[PDB]
Amino acid sequence: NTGSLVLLRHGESDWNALNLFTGWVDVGLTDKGQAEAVRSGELIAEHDLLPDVLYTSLLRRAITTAHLALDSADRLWIPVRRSWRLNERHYGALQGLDKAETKARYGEEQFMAWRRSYDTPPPPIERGSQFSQDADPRYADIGGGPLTECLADVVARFLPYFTDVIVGDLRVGKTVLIVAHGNSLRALVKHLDQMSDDEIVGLNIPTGIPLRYDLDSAMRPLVRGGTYLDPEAAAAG
Amino acid sequence: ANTGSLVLLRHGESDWNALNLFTGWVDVGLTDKGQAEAVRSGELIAEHDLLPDVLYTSLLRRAITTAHLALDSADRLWIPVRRSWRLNERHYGALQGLDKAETKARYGEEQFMAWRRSYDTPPPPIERGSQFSQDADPRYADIGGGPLTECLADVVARFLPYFTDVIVGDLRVGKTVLIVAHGNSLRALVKHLDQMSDDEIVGLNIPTGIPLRYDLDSAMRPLVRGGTYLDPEAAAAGAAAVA
Amino acid sequence: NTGSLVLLRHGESDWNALNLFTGWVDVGLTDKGQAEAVRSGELIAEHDLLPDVLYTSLLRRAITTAHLALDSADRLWIPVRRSWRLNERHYGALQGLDKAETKARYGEEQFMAWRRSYDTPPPPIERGSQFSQDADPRYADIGGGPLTECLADVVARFLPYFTDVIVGDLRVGKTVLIVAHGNSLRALVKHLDQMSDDEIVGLNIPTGIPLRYDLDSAMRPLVRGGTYLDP
Amino acid sequence: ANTGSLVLLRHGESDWNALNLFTGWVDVGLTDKGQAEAVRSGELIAEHDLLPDVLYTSLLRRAITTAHLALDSADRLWIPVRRSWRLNERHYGALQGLDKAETKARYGEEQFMAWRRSYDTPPPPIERGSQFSQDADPRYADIGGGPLTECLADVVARFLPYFTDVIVGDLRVGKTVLIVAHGNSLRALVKHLDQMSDDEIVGLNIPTGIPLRYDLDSAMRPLVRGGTYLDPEAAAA
16 A cells, blocks of 8 residues: 555644744744644544654754644654745745735735745844844754745755655555645645646635645655545635 | 754652552553642743743553643643653553552462563453453544553654654654653653663653753754753652652 | 764766766766775774764665775774765766767757856756656655755755754764765765855866864854865 | 565685684784685675675674675676674684694693683683773774683673674665674674584584575564575585
């Protein structure tokens, strides 16, 4: 068997609650976000999808979600690997700004572009500014990381991790759990279902509902778009 | 590189500590108070700028969650982690799941203290397949389901290969290593670091919640015999508090 | 402090002897190529630079070079990791061709652009052809791999391996040996010395002579262009 | 077809084998005869459709070079490799660097035989810092220089941890594993797999340069006790 691949997007963070652009800013989960993660773990267990290995980003809202999920699934003991390549998109100079206030100041057109352009990133964040990560030691091996990203950049930096590290696990039949972010999971779905640049821009992935991919020998999905474990909950839009 | 700092951390109160039951490999959770201890452990590591570069744990949720909580308060959640059965608590054999007092009453003082601490005599073997046995748990599949009981000598034998072949090389290249584990496995490590006698380690008590820093030389010999607790006062009192 | 980085480009292959474009074709070293690897090892040992870890490509001419070098340096026992990201540039449909046939097939203008461009790859090789690698199981996790590459493509797929794996070793003080290929090492030098797209394409890297890069905390060369270990 | 195949290979003639010297951890190389054995072993592997997915060796060049030549012939040079002292030949203590005559001279005939086939009695410890001692070799730093002598019981004891915690996991996910090592370390492994007595394993011969195949069940139990050589006709010679 090619192993099952389970994707999970973390739930509500503190900055989600404040309605701020977060990006690589390392904020925590709200109480609700923590409760969602626990249920995530129940769903996984309820559908007989116990992971053999866990992949996360370097961001605590994904790492804690993963912890809580595995705790509820009774699989805390399994191996885990973490990579910046699973991080959320870097939001550049938007990091720390209010979304509502931003939409107003620049309008819906610039807003939507910033949020949803595939090829065009926001302005670069200022090095060593309050909400920049360029001085964080976790990014020293990449020279502090990018100053901004668009989804096309996420795709480019995510995919090497997937092919070089995770695919190997699936190939030998392991069930893989990936806990990460809207943009990095959108990047992976774009690759798995071989989606176009404009098709991927309309893709929404809901929080806290595990998404199961059943792959073939070629790492090709058996079911395009995968299968959510709670379709009606997924279905909130 | 100059040799990395080694940090040892014993988890706090579990649900079975609270019910006074022998635990061993039974995979019980933490009490609210054991969780609070772990958060505090993290603060101490940070206030003493001992930020870890890598984490090692057992396969037991009370250590794993202790680790998560400490790294979160130390803001080092993102570091790599490795887990191994070789860091597990001593297996308590047929004592797993039984009340310590009730067991003391029935078997006697001397037998009770021999089981808990006798360096070379383990408790009686657990029944394969029984309610508090781990022998059929997949996580121990590659070791044939594991031992049915253990003495400290047993823990020392199965713990050290992991220390020398995995953790030491981290220390050698200068990484700050955090090990979050259990009473007997950490006592097994301390026995080895400080080259303690069988007789001496039986008396050693390691307090919960308080990180212990070892400063090692190039040959992995401690520069401070017995290491240094980040809260030496608490340490002395936790060393008492035990059980 | 930061570890030393030692770079080694393998010596003569069987196809170099016939002047054939090789790319990912997995051809072996000539006997001269082998002897050059042995000497490479002697030079490393002669300069007291004993590696703590080895990185190679998936191609036998580098793998064997590394084996012979480490043998002669008496550091055979060290950990080794291999990656397609360290492979030679894929030469697309030129793989297996000599110049003549290539200028014949593709004209002199493209022969030139394909030789000196940074951003123009050769034509894609045909899938399942005799000198294609798309069916090799070693490339299964990347869907068989690319069917052609320009230097820019090599830079793009090389650097993730360098930052995410090799720089970590360097940061904790290890001496790192990389045994690879003209263009993969060219890509690395581009990064280390921050060279321009225009300047990198004709950068020369001699075979069989180790190249030592002393770096600072910031992974920046103390010496621009490194130091060749040689008489 | 889920539990992977195990392929064991004992290197051929070393330069000290030619001088009839006790070698142990002394890191001598392969004779011309020895290399040819290696190359032929690789052809045998390929001829039997046994492509390795991963390679395990000792830290001793006679093994590592054997592995390289074998994989070269099988055209699997590119596969991942892991090396460990736990696959090393038995340490021969004070006998390292001695011939039979000089051994019988300073130690006597009575224990020469003892140290020959006693499961449990190691030769004398070698002098630390002496000419054929490895105690100061940096590759054994993490284990304090290593033991100063071994008996086969010792070898069994330090081998098995590596088998259960590293190699079995590969087998479990279906990989074909190639182990290239030495007489006493492969003996340790076969004693385990076929549950050989202490006294049984003393007279077990493993021929040099003939790959030994073990097919295993989920319990890591051989399907065929003793396994299957790839050149049966040559089993002893």
